[PDB]
Structures are given as C-alpha cells and as structure tokens.
C-alpha cells in the first residue's frame, strides 16, 4: 500500500485500534443495558422481512443481531457461552466484559502496560471468586424449598412472566423436581431440556399448564382411530410401518407369472405380520419416529389402537425413559426371528388427544418407572409464547443450578457492591500497577447495580453510594456482617436485605459470569493491532 | 532508494523520473532517431522528404534541408528537442551544415 508494508489491506495500530475495540464492545453492551433487572424492558427485532421477535434474553438478542466487528462478535459469543454453560446472566456477563474493557483501556491510555492490566484483572477475578465462595453464599439446605421458589422468581423478574412469578416459579420447581433422576455414582441429576415446552396462543398466561407426564406435539394418524386411552400400553418404535420394499441390492425378476401375485401380496403381508405381532402383546398406543402407511393405520384402527407417526427422536426417547418402554429400531431378537415382548412395552395412566385452541396434541399422563414433566405455555400470540418459552428455559436452568450446587448468592447488586469494596481494599497489597488494575476491576463490577438503578429510573449515584457504605460497614465491623445481604430494591429506590427479601441467584451464575467476562476482557485487551484484508 | 521506485511516489499524477540507464536510453534513442531521420539527405546523392503536415491546412513541403525537416516534425523526446534546436541555431548562424551537425551529434 502507501506504506512500505505491501499487505493488501488496512492496518490500525495502537490507541486507534484499542479505542475502536472498546467502542465496539461498548456498542454491544449499550444495546442490551436497557434489558437488565426487574425494571428492564423488552426489545423488538425485525428480520428485514417483517419477522418479529420480542425478547429480554441478551443471548437471544446478540444471536439475532448481525454483528460485523470482531471485538463485538467476541462478546456475542461470550453471551452464547454463558447461555450454554449457565442459562442466566447472559446480559450481565456482556455488560461486565464491556465495562472491564472500558476501564482497562482507560488504564492503557494512562500508559499502564496491558500485561499489567491483564495480570491485575486475573488476580482480581481469582480473589473475587474466592471471596464470594467464602463469604457471600447461602445454603439452600438451610433455606429449604422457598429458596428454590425465590431463585425461580428472581430469575423470572425482568421477564414477561415476572409478576405471575408467584405461580410460574411453582410450576418450574415442580417440573425440575419431577424430572429429577439419580444415576450410577448416586449423584442427583436434573436433566433440563427433558422438560417439554409447547407454545399455544390463546388463554392467559396464568392458564399455562404443568403436565404430570408428557406432552407430544403430534396427533393420531387416522381420524377413525380413538383419541383417548386409559390403561395405555405404549410401544415406542424407531422404524417405519409401510408396504415393504426390497432393499437396493435385491431385485425381483419373474420368469413364471404365477409368482407375481404372491410376491406383490407378500410386500404388504410382511408389515401386516409385524403390526399383528406388536398388537398381540396389548399395545394400544404406538408412537413411531417413521411413517405409517394408510394400509397400516387401518390395522391400528380395526384393533382400536392409537398410532402416531413422525414422532421426534428426542420426544420418543423421553417418552420411553418416562413410561418404561424400549425404543425398538427393529423387531428382531437374539434368535434370528421377529418378536415383540410385553416387557418392551411402556405404561401410562392415560394417553389422550387434547384440544388446544386451534390445534391438537397428545398427552401422556402419569407414566410409571419415572416421573416426567411437560409445560404448555398459553399466551396472546406467538411472540408472547416464544418469550415465555425463553424465560421459562432461563428459570429452569436457574433452578437446576440451585439444585446441583446448593449455594446461592443475594441479588440486586449485593455481590457486586461487596466485591467492589473488598477488591478496592485488597488492591493495596498487590504491586503498584496491578494495584490500579484491581481497583479498576472493582470499580467496573459496580456497573451492574448502576445499570439496575438507571433502568429503575432512580439516582444510581446515591443508591450505589448507600450500597457501598453498607458493604464497607459490613467488611469493617464484625458486628454487622449481616449487611452483606443488602442490595437494591428497585420498586422503592432503597437498599434492602435481599437474603430476607428472597432475591437469590445461583453462585455459579456470578462465578461463571466473572470468569467469562475476565477471559473476554483479557483476549480483547491483548490486541494492539489489526490487519483487515480486502476480500477476494 | 530512488525517486520513482520508492514506497512513496513523490510526484503529481502524470509526472515521471527516468533514472540513469532509462534516461540515457531514452536520450540516445531519441537523438539517434533524429539522426537516422535526417541522414539520407546528406550529400550530392541525397534524397528529399515529404513533410505533409496534419493540421487542417495539411501543408505539403518537399525538402532536403535538415533544419527545415527538424523544425517541421512533432518531437517529444527532450534530447531530440536539443538536437532540433541545435540544427535551428546552425541554420541561424550559417545557412548550411544543418544536416551534417545533426548527423555528427547523432
């Protein structure tokens, strides 16, 4: 180019590229800042075609956005990773990463070396994690089940299922406890994403349903089939029930016309015999991942059974695990024959086709050999229903984390204020420039209560000053250590004991948020040059 | 390095700077072109040229005078311009030798 370096592209270097990266990260964080906390508000997103999406989920927003800058794609992927590993905190992690970037670039402008800023950030992250784990956790055993309900309500605040939290939290907790299962190693496991979530516009939110059992977004294959069965014997099949076609390497070549008739009839009698074998054991409900020809549906109809086709593999796996059935890819035993044992059947106290507003689905109720849970969300339109689904997924992940790790922390900026105080006091011991880096980490942590108050339309300065005063008193006066639990009350603009108010978050949320935000800040801060090659 | 072959070009769009061998090349080629043009008019058995201007008047001259020939051509090589002016100054000083001075220089 014009410079001696003949690279065919543009080159930014130094404070130019550092300021640019910080500008990008700030842009991404300012997109989502307005959707943080019980007073945050939702966003519309239009996909250039009229496709509309209402949401409060920061990960969802940053996935839907079309980002061009790499330093902002980094934060988008950070939010995605937070959603994958935790399920909540997707906005807070982005805000914190951006604020860490801001303060770190301020230090680099003051000419503290980026290596020193990075060391200080690493130290502050480690010590904040340790201080949380040692001073700021509450045992869910000491608190009981209202702890789980409070964690769910805290996660649901800032969502469109907020005020109805009193009831949605009960639903979420019941569902996670229902899908609780213990495996080998005797460890309790709560495999969310096994709770099924269906959406159906119509009745109000409060009319959403918790299904003790399973809900299938499918219908019977023939209108002549029954649509309710009580003592359901369930057969889960992973193969198709159709007129049998010889495989690729097999050809029929007739030289005696008298065989054609029997061959053609055998092509159907094979599947007929398989279906008869299945039905002879007592299976009155047959779910299939594959298809079911009409010829076969007629067999089921005449038998008085309920057959369902094109079921999804994951739905089938869940129904099987929940009812006690065995998914069969083939009717084939270790004796080279074709049989179907009654032990491969599952059971359920009822299987019905229930009418939801303008569609129909199947409900498998009270499965034995395990308890399962499904949730049918009911709102005013698909936008509401989708946002309810996302919020409920967040709440389910939160309850799962609370049950896996039995530690919670208070919300409303309590943790951030306590960490700000403790780290601004702790920086005095570590070096001279890492000291400044740790102080800036502490100050950055305050962006969460600041943003909460700003969104609540309150004096962020005064509120966060009161918070920091309380937490400093707690950290300097051993007689008032109970002040740690104080955080923001955004409905009144006054600090409050959030452990007694019930504003709880899983420790893993804050810990992983901090770790990921620090990693993102470090990677972006390490960049001091940029070479953008002209496309080809 | 060099004025032209440097990471920065120091010139306005349309300028140029021929360096040592390129400059001597263009100079020798221009001068020798002028000389080869103006010879074959030299001496008793020298032959004439047709000038045949290309303006809207399309003047037509049949000359054996080297000064006239060089004056009436569109020259763009600087060394060639030098030789042309030399022949003109010869024609001003004396009236003969305008082809011999050019051939000698070439």
């Amino acid at each position: 180019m014009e410079g001696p370096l003949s690279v065919f592209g543009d080159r930014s270097t130094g404070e130019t590229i550092r300021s640019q990266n910080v500008m990008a990260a700030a842009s991404i964080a300012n997109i989502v800042k307005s959707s943080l906390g019980p007073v945050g508000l939702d966003k519309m997103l239009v996909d250039d075609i009229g496709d509309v999406t209402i949401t409060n989920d920061g990960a969802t927003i940053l996935k839907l956005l079309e980002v061009e800058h790499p330093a902002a794609k980094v934060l988008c992927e950070l939010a995605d990773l937070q959603d994958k590993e935790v399920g909540d905190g997707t906005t807070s992690v982005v805000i914190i990463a951006a604020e860490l970037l801001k303060n770190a670039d301020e230090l680099v402008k003051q000419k503290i070396h980026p290596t020193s800023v990075i060391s200080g950030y690493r130290l502050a992250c480690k010590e904040a994690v340790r201080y949380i784990n040692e001073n700021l956790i509450v045992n869910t055993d000491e608190l009981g089940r209202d702890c789980l309900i409070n964690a769910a309500k805290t996660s649901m605040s800032s969502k469109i299922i907020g005020i109805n939290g009193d009831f949605f939290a009960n639903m979420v907790v019941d569902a996670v406890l229902a899908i609780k299962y213990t495996d080998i190693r005797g460890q309790p496991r709560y495999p969310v994403n096994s709770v099924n979530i269906l959406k159906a516009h119509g009745r109000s939110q409060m009319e959403s349903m918790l299904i003790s059992g399973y809900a299938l977004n499918c219908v019977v294959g023939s209108q002549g089939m029954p649509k309710r069965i009580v003592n359901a014997k369930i057969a889960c099949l992973d193969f198709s029930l159709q007129k049998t076609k010889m495989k690729l390497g097999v050809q029929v070549v007739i030289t005696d016309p008298e065989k054609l008739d029997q061959i053609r009839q055998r092509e159907s009698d094979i599947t007929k015999e398989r279906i008869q074998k299945i039905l002879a054991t007592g299976a009155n409900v047959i779910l299939t991942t594959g298809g079911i020809d009409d010829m076969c549906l007629k067999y089921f109809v005449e038998a008085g059974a309920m057959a369902v086709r094109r079921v999804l593999k994951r739905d089938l796996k869940r129904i099987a695990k929940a009812s006690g059935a065995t998914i069969l890819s083939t009717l084939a035993n270790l004796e080279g024959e074709e049989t179907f044992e009654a032990a491969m059947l599952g059971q359920a106290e009822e299987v019905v086709q229930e009418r939801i507003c303008d569609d129909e689905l199947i409900l498998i109720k009270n499965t034995k050999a395990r308890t399962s849970a499904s949730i049918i969300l009911r709102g005013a339109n698909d936008f509401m229903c989708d946002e309810m689904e996302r919020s409920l997924h967040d709440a389910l992940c939160v309850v799962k984390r609370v049950l896996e790790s039995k530690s919670v922390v208070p919300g409303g900026g309590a943790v951030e204020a306590a960490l700000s105080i403790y780290l601004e006091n702790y920086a005095t011991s570590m070096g001279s420039r890492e000291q400044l880096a740790i102080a800036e980490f502490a100050r950055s942590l305050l962006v969460i209560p600041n943003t909460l108050a700003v969104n609540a339309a309150q004096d962020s300065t005064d509120l966060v000053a009161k918070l920091r005063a309380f937490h400093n008193e707690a950290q300097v006066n051993p007689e008032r250590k109970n002040l740690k639990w104080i955080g923001l009350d955004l409905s009144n603009g006054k600090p409050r004991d959030n452990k007694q108010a019930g504003v709880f978050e899983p420790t893993i949320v804050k810990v992983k948020s901090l770790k990921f935000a620090t990693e993102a800040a470090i990677t972006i801060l390490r960049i001091d040059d940029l070479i953008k090659l002209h496309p080809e | 390095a060099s004025l032209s072959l440097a990471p920065v070009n120091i010139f306005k769009a349309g300028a140029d700077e021929e360096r040592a061998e390129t400059a001597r090349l263009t100079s020798f080629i221009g001068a020798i072109a002028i000389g080869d043009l103006v010879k074959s008019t030299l001496g008793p058995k020298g032959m004439d040229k047709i000038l045949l201007s290309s303006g809207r008047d399309a003047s037509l001259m049949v000359t054996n005078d080297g000064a006239t020939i060089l004056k009436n051509i569109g020259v763009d090589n600087p060394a060639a311009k030098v030789l042309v002016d030399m022949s003109r100054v010869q024609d001003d000083e004396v009236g003969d030798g305008t082809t011999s001075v050019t051939v000698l220089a070439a």
């Binding site: 014009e2 410079g3 001696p4 930014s12 270097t13 130094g14 130019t16 300021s19 640019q20 500008m23 700030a26 842009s27 300012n30 | 390095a1 060099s2 004025l3 440097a6 990471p7 920065v8 070009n9 120091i10 010139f11 306005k12 769009a13 300028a15 700077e17 040592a20 400059a23 100079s27 763009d76 600087p78 060394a79 311009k81 030098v82 002016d85 030399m86 003109r88 100054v89 010869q90 024609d91 001003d92 000083e93 004396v94 009236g95």
Partner: protein, 537 residues
C-alpha cells in the same frame, strides 16, 4: 492512509466531526516520521548525483514540453513537479540557499537528506525526535564554530584578482561552462568588481545585464563594459556605427505634445486649421533642433516616434534608437554617465551621456540586430553577452554565471574562505565527533549521527568521481587527523594531490555556514512534525 475518525458511535447514531472525514486521510507518529524521512531521502538521492565537478546534469521538462538541462539544485527542485509536502519543504530549503547565497543549492539538500536518514536509525533505537533535533542543533553549532576556526581569508581588491578567479573557477567547475572555465570566471569577477559598492559592501544585480544570443560559440561570451540592447537604429539608412557618441536619453516620444487630461482642441476656421498644421510642423522641427543644439550625435528614446521625426533625425545626422525599455534606458544612463530627460526643453549638454562606441551588430543569417553601447568612461553598469550552440546551454550558462556572480558577491560581503572538496565537511565531522565524545548526555548519539551525515558530501563527491567512497573518505579523514590539515579532501579531478588549498578549490565561509544552518533548521522543522492531514484526491 489512516482515516480521521473510525467509530461512527458507541450507540449507532451518526458520528460526523470533520468535513469529508471519510475522504480525508491522516498519518500520525513514528510512521509519519518515517514517511517524511523516506520522501526526503528520495529527493536527496535524486540530487546527490549532481554534486561536484564529475557531477551529472538533469533534463527537466515543463508542462508545455520545454527542455532545461541543468546541474543547479535549486533550478532542478523548482522545475520538479513534487506532490509530497516534505519534498516541497526541501524545494523551499534549496530555494532559500539560492536566495541567501546563490551556491550550495545541492549541498543543502544532500545534507538535509543525510541528517534525516540518520535520524531514521536514531528513531528506530527509540530516541525522541525532539532530542534528535536538539542534538543536531548542538552539533550544528559545533560545526559552525569549527568552520569559523578553520576558515581562511582572501583579498577582494581590484589589483590582484587571482583569489577571486580561483573561487569563481571552483564554483563553475561543476557546470557545462567549464569548457571556458577561466574565461567565465574572469568575466564574472570583472563584472562584480566593475559593478560593486566596496564601501557599502553591496552588489546590485540589476546593474548586471546577462544577455544570451544563439549562434557563435561559448568561447565568444564576453564582458561588455556598458550595455547591449535588442534594438537597431530607427531609420534603415542611418549609419550602423557611431564613434565618440554624445547620447541624449529621452522618455518623451518624438511626437507632438499631448496633455494627460482629457482635452479637446477645437478647430473653428480655415485659419485655425492652418495654424494647427503649422504648429505640428514647427513642433517636429523644434524637437529636432533642440536635440541638435544640445550637441548630441545620437538619441535614445523610450517611446518610439513617427515618420517626420525619423526623417528629420536622418537629415540632421542624428542616429536614433526607439522603443527602448525602461530598464535598458536606466542602464544606458548609468553606463554612459548621462541623465534621463523627460522632455526636450529640459535637455542640456551636461545631461548627455558619452560612449566611445555605439554600434549595430549582426548575427549571421538572421535579420535581427543588436545595439552595443561601450567604451564608456567609468561605467557602473555592465553586460554579459553569452553565445552558444543551443538555448539549453545558453540558459545553463546564464544560471552558472549567476552562481559565479553570487559567489563573488558573497566574497565582497565576507572575505573569509574555507577550502572545499569535502575537506571542510570532514573537518567539521571530526570536530563534532570530538565534542560528542566529550558530551555525556543522550545527545551523544545525535551528534555522532550529525557527523556521519556531514560526511555524505565527501562520499558523494568520491562516488560521482568513481572512487570508492568509504576507502577514500576514511583515508583522507585519517590524514586530516594525523597531519592537521583541514584542506585535505577528495581528488575529484584526479590531480594526484588531496590538498584543496593547492588545487585552488575554494568555498565561501558564509556559504558553508549557511548550508549547515539551513539543513539543520529544516531537518528540525521536519522532525518536529508527527501528524499529517490531507484532503482526499
């Protein structure tokens, strides 16, 4: 390069700060400094081959295709169509050297380029460009004092002009006119000494008319102690030579008088008409009679005249020149000792000039005539008539002789003289090295760089002369330090000896000091720049 502003906002709203910021460019910091240094080095390496006797010329072509062959650095850089602003600064630097001195226009550029090339390595090692500039200023002061120390003095008298002729020959050694080396030096010296105010120490160049005419040979160039004009006598039957000419210099057209104010002379009768006719006739006769009664044998008007006046001059034996320009009228007055007369009534025998010869000169087969006025008594004006085979060598001869005249002027202004051939530069480099050794601060590096830059002129002379630069320069430096002789330099002409005092290679002390000072000041101004902003296209 880089753009003015690349954010467009942390909120997505338009961020427009500077007008046409998207079309504008910007370079900041060390990359800007290195771009400057690269441009300056390119210019300096272009110029360095035109340095010294064995230096070669450059062929400049203007917009309209006119050719200029020259060795003059100022003329080259003025004809150069540069776009880089640092190259423009270097052109201004050379022009400044030409204004102040009239010689050194290539040395200044070479030295500035070398200083910037050394600053390049100093900046790579991490020194602040201002620290580099300050070390360069310190070393420049040291070199200036060393020049004052090693300087010599020459006599500027009009009796023995050999030192001045040697100086002018040194100045003209590198120019195409070294074929007539001593003739050109002699005429430059005689010109300035004829027209030079010794008491004031001033030399007015308006009194030196440098005229060129194609034809003839360069050896025909001569000094006329008087004036040459591009005119001929007004009437073709007038004589072409006038000896012992008493000259009447007039700025009144030989025509009937005319008021400057809007006037209307009214004719109201045949008697008025005849009176007007007779008035006109008698005016012409009275003008010619006044010029004759003054005793003049020659007239020189500035504004031309008509048929009656021309024929009356011819009849009265008064050869006459018309349409002479104001400057030439002034020069003729100054040369002949005459006074310029605004009207004939004011003309007297004392206001006349005297020239022992006024002649009309031909130039072969041309039809163009020139008028020479010479053999004046004590002409304080002079003319240099240059001949040659083409306008290119004529123009180069003009500018080379201007260089020689400017050098003699600088001698008249300050007679102190340093010896050239790179000897002065080597000696100043030695002095700067010694002072850098005695300097304990961080400017040591800048001063050593200044010395290594001062040493580019002897290296350039050697290279242009085909010798090996490093070998020759190290040997002559070693000889200078061993046997103390700041007159040891590069034997560009291969005379055997390295002694420039023996080869009569002579420079002006003010010239060398001005070279060093200008190079250092411009290098400082360039190093002080760390941000360029330029409009798009």
């Amino acid at each position: 390069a880089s753009m003015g502003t690349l954010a467009f906002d942390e909120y997505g709203r338009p961020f427009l700060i500077i007008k046409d910021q998207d079309r504008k460019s910007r370079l900041m910091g060390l990359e800007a400094l290195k771009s400057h240094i690269m441009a300056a080095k390119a210019v300096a390496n272009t110029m360095r081959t035109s340095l010294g006797p064995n230096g070669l010329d450059k062929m400049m072509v203007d917009k309209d295709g006119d050719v200029t062959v020259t060795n003059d650095g100022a003329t080259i850089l003025s004809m150069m169509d540069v776009d880089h602003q640092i190259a423009k600064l270097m052109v201004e630097l050379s022009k400044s050297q030409d204004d102040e001195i009239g010689d050194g226009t290539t040395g200044v550029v070479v030295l500035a380029g070398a200083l910037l090339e050394e600053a390049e390595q100093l900046l790579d090692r991490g020194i602040h460009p201002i620290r580099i500039a300050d070390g360069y200023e310190q070393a420049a002061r040291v070199a200036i004092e060393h020049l004052d120390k090693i300087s010599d003095s020459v006599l500027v008298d009009i009796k023995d002009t050999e030192p001045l002729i040697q100086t002018a020959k040194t100045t003209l050694g590198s120019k195409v006119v070294n074929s007539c080396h001593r003739q050109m030096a002699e005429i430059a010296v005689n010109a300035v000494l004829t027209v030079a105010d010794m008491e004031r120490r001033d030399v007015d160049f308006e009194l030196i008319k440098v005229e060129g005419k194609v034809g003839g040979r360069l050896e025909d160039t001569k000094l006329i102690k008087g004036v040459i004009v591009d005119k001929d006598f007004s009437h073709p039957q007038m004589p072409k030579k006038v000896e012992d000419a008493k000259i009447a210099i007039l700025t009144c057209p030989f025509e009937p008088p005319k008021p400057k104010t809007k006037h209307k002379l009214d004719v109201t009768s045949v008697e008025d008409y005849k009176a007007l006719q007779k008035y006109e006739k008698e005016k012409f006769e009275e003008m010619i009679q006044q010029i004759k009664e003054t005793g003049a044998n020659l007239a020189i008007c500035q504004w031309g005249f008509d048929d009656e006046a021309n024929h009356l001059l011819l009849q009265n034996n008064l050869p006459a020149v018309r349409w002479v320009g104001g400057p030439e009228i002034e020069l003729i007055a100054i040369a002949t000792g005459g006074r310029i007369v605004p009207r004939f009534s004011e003309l007297t025998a004392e206001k006349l000039g005297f020239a022992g010869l006024v002649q009309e000169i031909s130039f072969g087969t041309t039809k163009d005539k020139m008028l020479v006025i010479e053999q004046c008594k004590n002409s304080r004006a002079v003319t240099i008539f240059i001949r040659g085979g083409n306008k290119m060598i004529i123009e180069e001869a003009k500018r080379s002789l201007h260089d020689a005249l400017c050098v003699i002027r600088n001698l008249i202004r300050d007679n102190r003289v340093v010896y050239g051939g790179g000897a002065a530069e080597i000696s100043c480099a030695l002095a700067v090295s010694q002072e850098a050794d005695k300097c304990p601060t961080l400017e040591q590096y800048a001063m050593r760089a200044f010395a290594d830059a001062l040493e580019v002129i002897p290296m350039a002379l050697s290279e242009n002369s085909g010798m090996n630069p490093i070998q020759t320069m190290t040997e002559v430096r070693a000889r200078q330090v061993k046997e103390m002789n700041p007159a040891l330099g590069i034997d560009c002409l291969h005379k055997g000896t390295n002694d420039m005092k023996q080869q009569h290679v002579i420079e002006t002390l003010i010239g060398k000091k001005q070279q060093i000072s200008l190079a250092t000041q411009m290098v400082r101004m360039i190093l002080k720049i760390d941000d360029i902003r330029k409009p798009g296209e």
